[PDB]
Enzyme design. Sequence first.
Site, PDB file in Angstrom:
ATOM      1  N   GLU A   1     -23.741  20.527   2.654  1.00 49.81           N
ATOM      2  CA  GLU A   1     -23.173  21.184   1.489  1.00 49.81           C
ATOM      3  C   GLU A   1     -24.163  21.043   0.335  1.00 49.81           C
ATOM      4  O   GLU A   1     -23.793  20.633  -0.765  1.00 49.81           O
ATOM      5  CB  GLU A   1     -21.822  20.542   1.167  1.00 49.81           C
ATOM      6  CG  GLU A   1     -20.852  21.465   0.436  1.00 49.81           C
ATOM      7  CD  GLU A   1     -19.670  20.742  -0.190  1.00 49.81           C
ATOM      8  OE1 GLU A   1     -19.228  19.708   0.361  1.00 49.81           O
ATOM      9  OE2 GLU A   1     -19.174  21.236  -1.225  1.00 49.81           O
TER      10      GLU A   1
ATOM     11  N   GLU B 278     -30.845  23.245  -5.031  1.00 48.59           N
ATOM     12  CA  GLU B 278     -30.651  21.821  -4.785  1.00 48.59           C
ATOM     13  C   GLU B 278     -31.611  21.326  -3.702  1.00 48.59           C
ATOM     14  O   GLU B 278     -31.488  20.191  -3.248  1.00 48.59           O
ATOM     15  CB  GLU B 278     -29.201  21.531  -4.395  1.00 48.59           C
ATOM     16  CG  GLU B 278     -28.225  21.628  -5.563  1.00 48.59           C
ATOM     17  CD  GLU B 278     -26.785  21.263  -5.239  1.00 48.59           C
ATOM     18  OE1 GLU B 278     -26.485  20.925  -4.076  1.00 48.59           O
ATOM     19  OE2 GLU B 278     -25.958  21.319  -6.170  1.00 48.59           O
TER      20      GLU B 278
END
Lengths: 303, 307, 318, 318
Positions: free
Chosen positions: D116, D125
């Site tokens: 995730e 990210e």
Amino acid sequence: PNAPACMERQLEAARYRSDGALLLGASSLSGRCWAGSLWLFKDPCAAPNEGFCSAGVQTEAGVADLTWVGERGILVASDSGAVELWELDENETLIVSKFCKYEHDDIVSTVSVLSSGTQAVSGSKDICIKVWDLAQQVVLSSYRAHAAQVTCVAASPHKDSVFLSCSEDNRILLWDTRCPKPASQIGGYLPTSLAWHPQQSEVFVFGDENGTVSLVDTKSCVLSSAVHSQCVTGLVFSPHSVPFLASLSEDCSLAVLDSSLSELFRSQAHRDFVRDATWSPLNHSLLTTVGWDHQVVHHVVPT
Amino acid sequence: RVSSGRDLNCVPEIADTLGAVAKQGFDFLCMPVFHPRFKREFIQEPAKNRPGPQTRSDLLLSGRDWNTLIVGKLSPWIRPDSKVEKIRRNSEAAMLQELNFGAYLGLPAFLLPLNQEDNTNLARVLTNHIHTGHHSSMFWMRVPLVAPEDLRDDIIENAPTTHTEEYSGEEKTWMWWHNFRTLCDYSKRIAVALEIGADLPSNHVIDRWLGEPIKAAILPTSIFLTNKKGFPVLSKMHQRLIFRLLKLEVQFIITGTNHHSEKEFCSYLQYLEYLSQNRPPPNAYELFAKGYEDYLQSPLQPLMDNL
Amino acid sequence: ESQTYEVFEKDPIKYSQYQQAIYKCLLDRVPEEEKDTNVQVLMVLGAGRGPLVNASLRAAKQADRRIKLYAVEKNPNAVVTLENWQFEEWGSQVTVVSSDMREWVAPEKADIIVSELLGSFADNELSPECLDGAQHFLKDDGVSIPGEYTSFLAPISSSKLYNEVRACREKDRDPEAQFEMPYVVRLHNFHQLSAPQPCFTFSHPNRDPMIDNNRYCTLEFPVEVNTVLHGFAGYFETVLYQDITLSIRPETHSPGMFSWFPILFPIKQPITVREGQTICVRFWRCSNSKKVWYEWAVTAPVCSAIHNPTGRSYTIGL
Amino acid sequence: ESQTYEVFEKDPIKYSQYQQAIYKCLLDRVPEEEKDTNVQVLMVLGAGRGPLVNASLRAAKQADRRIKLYAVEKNPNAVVTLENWQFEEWGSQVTVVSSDMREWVAPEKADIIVSELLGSFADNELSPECLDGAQHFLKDDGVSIPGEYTSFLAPISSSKLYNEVRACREKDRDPEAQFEMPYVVRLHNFHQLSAPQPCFTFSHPNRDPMIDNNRYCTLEFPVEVNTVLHGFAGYFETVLYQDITLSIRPETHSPGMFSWFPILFPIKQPITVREGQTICVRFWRCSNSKKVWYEWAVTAPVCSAIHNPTGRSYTIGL
Ligand SMILES: Nc1ccc2[nH]c(CN3C(=O)c4cc(F)ccc4[C@]34CCN(Cc3ccc(F)cc3)C4=O)cc2n1
Ligand SMILES: Nc1ccc2[nH]c(CN3C(=O)c4cc(F)ccc4[C@]34CCN(Cc3ccc(F)cc3)C4=O)cc2n1
Ligand SMILES: CSC[C@H]1O[C@@H](n2cnc3c(N)ncnc32)[C@H](O)[C@@H]1O
Ligand SMILES: CSC[C@H]1O[C@@H](n2cnc3c(N)ncnc32)[C@H](O)[C@@H]1O
């Protein structure tokens, strides 16, 4: 067996009594609930299995230190600030609370029973040292002698009024309650553990934070040896006429030393901190250690 | 009326502890994030590879509870300024861990002790933590009004207490603070939790703390006298001090066990409330000024500007 | 740059010491009866344009011993110099390697590793970290040259230098960033208050389990005059092998050598010091996975702020 | 922080999609006849406080298949949550690992890896870098969830948002640093000029030799109105397994889900755009061994400056 379902991970103390029943204290220093417990093992080899215990009880808070009050009684140093006394029943299956006196203002770290057996001395992080009467269940005296957390207190084996203490203020105080000023400072690294010599009333040993185990006479000149790589947690002499000293530490090891602090035995059995040691009164060559790794190891000391 | 908290170093169940504290009338709870006695290794095997959880879960309380009702405490075994290199390095890693976990929980404040002179490496680690991620957590430095060495009982035979008037020496705990906050370069996150002793020092030693960022005032249960009724009270010396502290609007923390066993623990707080109500009320000046305390404003220039 | 290596090479004293150091080690490691049996594996770690390689050749010839040279260098621009030299002069005795020493997978273990990864404060070029990473391809009984180095500090009074640092304020950064970073400077108009004292020491090969290059040192400097402290002069000593050394510490300065000027650690605010008082300074060596930096603070006679916390103003790149 | 994980967990739509995605993959990988013979090795990479672990348990129960869970998490504060849960609830089926996935030496290879690691611009990210590093302990026929994700861009006019960015000027940095960094923002008072177009795409497991996560994409946006360009809204889509997806792209937005607001890439100076003209934007994904960052530039109808060169104003930490 008329006791809690599961004991806590971190085993803090282990003591043998006259006959040879292994007392166990334990704390939970992790997880949801930070409480302690007391256990009895008429079978030392069964430890630390909860299904095969003679006695067991859950305490309100953790168990920092304990010791035998003869045969029945167990005196506890609690985190709550209370010094607790528990007593075995006549069958020795239950453990009922005798007293539980909140007098210390911080964790009670160390406790020791004096010669008479109706008195004890406790040491806490609140820096105080208190003298108890186990009969009347009250504090006789309160002493703020140190300037930091009291680490270890140790009653003289044959003298009721005398006891040692040590603290993070780097003081080792020799006490004698008969004197107006009872404390007497014995003249680098902080003292962490104390142990009176069993056959000599004027001799004691102390272990420091740096790992050095020392040998002190009350008169004079000292002898020492670098036994451990980290803090010495406890020191316990054997029941022999010529005693062997068992030293435990946070380096996760055990060492048995002779009279001149020469290494005889070595044991890297534990994987966590070694918290206590107790010599078997039946077999003087056996030594039981407990640690935070939740082991109860029985060592065959070559004697 | 008065904002008060409870200091504990023993919490067997975090949910139960709060309930008891809240029922007694306290606003918040000073308590440890890791078990005080749970000493941890970070370098040497095999203790560094100790399994299991290191402390309690954050889930036990709500986010809001952590944010408003809990104050953190550094563990007592953590000594960053130890002479032993191993203990220093271990205490460093432990201090960062505990401070980080404090920020993770989003604690409004966290207590660190000033209980000796040299707190340089302590300051160096805290400063480093302050200049890390994102947090607005205050750090309350627990500092005594009188050092523990200077209020010990004169009961050591071959080491008597200093019976000499040392004007500078009696101000030593302020110097402890001063040096620390200078090293940290006057961080607005760093404030004082002033610990009040049984014997108050000379007046000059107290005046020393005027103009310092005092956020808390720790009151041990031991300093409380007992009245004819058999309930906790304070001396006239301590009363004047509390009266002064109420003007600064600090948060009073109660620490230590219940020495007044016969009574409730609320009694201590009720006495502070009793003092809070019993003060000289604010005059027209202090009533109107209430709000603008130490608030900087530009001098008006009615000539240059039009008011 | 090319001309940065040029000025390094123009210090013959330094390399003659390296030459002598290697010469001695060869004789120690290889006896007379194993003169033409044993070929020593040398590995220059950070070869540059190859002065240490040349010195290693001279050393082996004056010693009359056989060597097998590697020339590890990360800078690809220098590796151009090395390979052109290697093709024209050295030959297949020297194996030029174009790699980081921390990364390089060695096809052979070294008897000696030579390096020149020292700045003015010894460890300010991260010589510890590099040689730690290159340690695995050293033989169990292998030698490092240098085998040790130490940094020294001394408190100084210089209203000139203080005012000079002050003037290094730049747009778009902290107003006082300039005070929280060291400078290489030929210290001239200054006063040294106390005698230099050792700060940080490093030994290679490092044999302390879980090697930690972080440090914390407290120094106490007895001052015998009234003065105003403005910073700390930094020097270094290094042991190449045994009695062969290099140094920029004034009292034990290598004569003639000029390949290193002293370093300066300033402070934000000057500090009064009375005669009889002691200057107490604290120095940290700090690191994470990306950077290494120093922090420092004066703790006597008055406290200063801790300088360069978290390497905010100055870091050394890994 | 704790409350950052809390608000993530308060999006049930997202995890139900993860649950369904894993449920489907289990059925595909394990037939009915091998129901109680084959135990699948799942590995949650970035477990947090363990929503994906719980979903993996639910998925296995509704599918009625056997699983062996690892819960890799680097954040040590979260690992406290995981272990307390694990002791109380999960048990020895879940093996909590407190490590970086790029570092962790796996004692077993995975059949499925769940992650995730997606932000508002998908790869912001560094999900590529992490899953690339964790790729080695995937089975040769192993699956990744998500298996793919794409980022989208769209030119926007917002004199409000432009003026908002402008006001993010801070002391002690570049005067225009604020324009050279993306922002997560619920875009309200704005006008989208052209329809979103795909920018960067990543597939896992990556099977392209010498995997390069650097990119360069040219987009042309047909504008049909007069306007003033102030920046570029950024969205993303992700394929969890097959037909199970998540999206914050307005036209294919997952209904109900609110675990991601759009991202904004500003520009220093507004750009006039006439009806009929094409906005041409260029986006780079750049990296070194320490950082990853984006650069961008408008090339039509007029040129802008290249924003965030060398990640001077904004980097993402590796
Ligand atoms: N690996 C190596 C090998 C040789 C090495 N020399 C050093 C010292 N150093 C600097 O750090 C430095 C930084 C600068 F911006 C400029 C110059 C330097 C020097 C190198 C030369 N020099 C002396 C000099 C300068 C100017 C002169 F007109 C005469 C003589 C230094 O002070 C580190 C090092 N590192
Ligand atoms: N690994 C993960 C797992 C979940 C993830 N969600 C995201 C998006 N994200 C940020 O980047 C971000 C940055 C911030 F300073 C603050 C908030 C965010 C969010 C997370 C929540 N939220 C929606 C929201 C916000 C505010 C609301 F009142 C309601 C709803 C975002 O926009 C990345 C990510 N990465
Ligand atoms: C002779 S000056 C020092 C030399 O060492 C080189 N160097 C520094 N660090 C490394 C490293 N980790 N691997 C290889 N060469 C290095 C530098 O590029 C320079 O040419
Ligand atoms: C559930 S939000 C994403 C989670 O992935 C974790 N994470 C990110 N990168 C890594 C990594 N390289 N190794 C392990 N966990 C990671 C983060 O700490 C966060 O809890």
